Ligand binder design. Structure first.
Ligand SMILES: *[C@@H]1O[C@H](CO[C@@H]2O[C@@H](C)[C@@H](O)[C@@H](O)[C@@H]2O)[C@@H](O[C@@H]2O[C@H](CO)[C@@H](O[C@H]3O[C@H](CO)[C@@H](O)[C@H](O)[C@@H]3O)[C@H](O)[C@H]2NC(C)=O)[C@H](O)[C@H]1NC(C)=O
Ligand SMILES: *[C@@H]1O[C@H](CO[C@@H]2O[C@@H](C)[C@@H](O)[C@@H](O)[C@@H]2O)[C@@H](O[C@@H]2O[C@H](CO)[C@@H](O)[C@H](O)[C@H]2NC(C)=O)[C@H](O)[C@H]1NC(C)=O
Ligand SMILES: *[C@@H]1O[C@H](CO)[C@@H](O)[C@H](O)[C@H]1NC(C)=O
Ligand SMILES: *[C@@H]1O[C@H](CO)[C@@H](O)[C@H](O)[C@H]1NC(C)=O
Length: 326
């Protein structure tokens, strides 16, 4: 036409002055938005006598921040690297991020905040507990320790450790929880009736001291032969001597453990405490046999009622340890 119209909207730029119509000869100026720099094309335009605006060669491109794609011992998500995009940071295993985790490209093309660096996780020398010693320790960095390094603790003699003995240098630079060495003592073990006890000749008995028990002839043990002084001050177990019992009835085949045995032959020297045997009893309902057990209890063994016993010489009847049924 003869009056030029509103200029074309150009991306990332602004036009001054901006009017719906211009007269021929009026001037408009394209200027890129902040953070965008002008490259190809020229901005200033003058209205021709014909209404048509000249073709626009101007191209505003975003300002480019310095390359930040390499983080030594780190990983960076970055995509574009130009205004106004942001980049993120991370570190590899054993490394902590020494600075801001995200940076942004400003209008001036300067990263803000400044770019971080990854630094190794370093752990201070471990502090030994009061009653403990350092069994092994290897400092990787100077006297300090790196990520996942270990120290193990050895308690002093006559002391008992509470808590795990291994400490790892963690991700946050602090050692894991430390064990405690305490001095614990154990009271003297009382001698068992009909038996003897042995311990070393010391005024006081401390941790892991062990006493050995015994019993005289005719008496067995119903506990562990060797007991130990545990971490809590009380002994591993208290054992006692329990009375062996006599063979209750001579001439009878009973069941000891898996197989069938004759009592008189199997326990010539008498039963021990807790030994379980089972007797055979006739049942006159269908003339079958069943099995009832009995066991020694500190010298007294109770024969089942159904055991009716007869002498072998009196072979008038059968020994009722016969038909398997029932
Ligand atoms: C060793 O330090 C660990 C970390 O504690 C903190 O770490 C520094 C980086 C710093 O922030 C400072 O304030 C502390 O020293 C202690 O462990 C815990 O670790 C948690 C797991 O990372 C953590 O918490 C997070 O998880 C919980 C549960 O999911 C969330 O509710 C919480 O918001 C966190 O995301 C926290 O850092 C820490 N918490 C506590 C109560 O300790 C650890 O105890 C310590 N060990 C020793 C022996 O001192
Ligand atoms: C040795 O002692 C531990 C510690 O428990 C004791 O219980 C108190 C009543 C008192 O006697 C203190 O000396 C101790 O704190 C015994 O462990 C206990 O076992 C049972 C199992 O449930 C129960 O009483 C408690 O849960 C346990 N104690 C704790 C602190 O949890 C242990 O039985 C004792 N004997 C032996 C052989 O270890
Ligand atoms: C390590 O050893 C001792 C610790 O007491 C100290 O004097 C020394 O300066 C330390 N050096 C380094 C590099 O950590
Ligand atoms: C705790 O001690 C046990 C030894 O009984 C060990 O196997 C375990 O690894 C220790 N805990 C940790 C976290 O290492």
């Amino acid at each position: 036409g003869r009056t030029c119209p509103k200029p074309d909207d150009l991306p990332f730029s602004t036009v001054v002055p901006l009017k719906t119509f211009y007269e021929p000869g009026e001037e408009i100026t394209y200027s890129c938005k902040p953070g965008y720099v002008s490259s190809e094309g020229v901005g200033k335009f003058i209205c021709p006598l014909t209404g048509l605006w000249p073709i626009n060669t101007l191209k505003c491109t975003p300002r480019v921040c310095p390359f930040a794609g390499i983080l030594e011992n780190g990983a960076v998500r970055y995509t574009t690297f130009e205004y106004p995009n942001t980049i993120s940071f991370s570190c590899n295993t054993g490394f902590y991020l020494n600075g801001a985790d995200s940076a942004k490209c400003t209008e001036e093309g300067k990263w803000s905040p400044e770019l971080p660096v990854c630094a190794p996780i370093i752990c201070p020398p471990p502090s030994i507990p009061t009653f403990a010693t350092l069994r092994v320790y290897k400092p990787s960095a100077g006297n300090n320790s790196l990520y996942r390094d270990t120290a193990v603790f050895e308690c002093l003699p006559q002391h008992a450790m509470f808590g795990n003995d291994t400490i790892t240098c963690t991700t946050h630079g602090n050692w894991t929880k430390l064990p405690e060495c305490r001095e614990v003592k154990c009271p003297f073990p009382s001698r068992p009736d009909n038996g003897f006890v042995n311990y070393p000749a010391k005024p006081t008995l401390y941790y892991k001291d062990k006493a050995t028990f015994g019993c005289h002839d005719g008496y067995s043990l119903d506990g562990p032969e060797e007991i130990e002084c545990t971490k809590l001050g009380n002994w591993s177990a208290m054992p006692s001597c329990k009375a062996s019992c006599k063979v209750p009835v001579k001439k009878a085949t009973v069941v000891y453990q898996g197989e069938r045995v004759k009592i008189q032959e199997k326990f010539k020297n008498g039963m021990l405490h807790g030994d379980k045997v089972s007797f055979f009893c006739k049942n006159k309902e269908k003339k079958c046999s069943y099995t009832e057990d009995a066991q020694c209890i500190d010298g007294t063994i109770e024969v089942p009622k159904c055991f009716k016993e007869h002498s072998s010489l009196a072979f008038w009847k059968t020994d009722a340890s016969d038909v398997k049924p029932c």
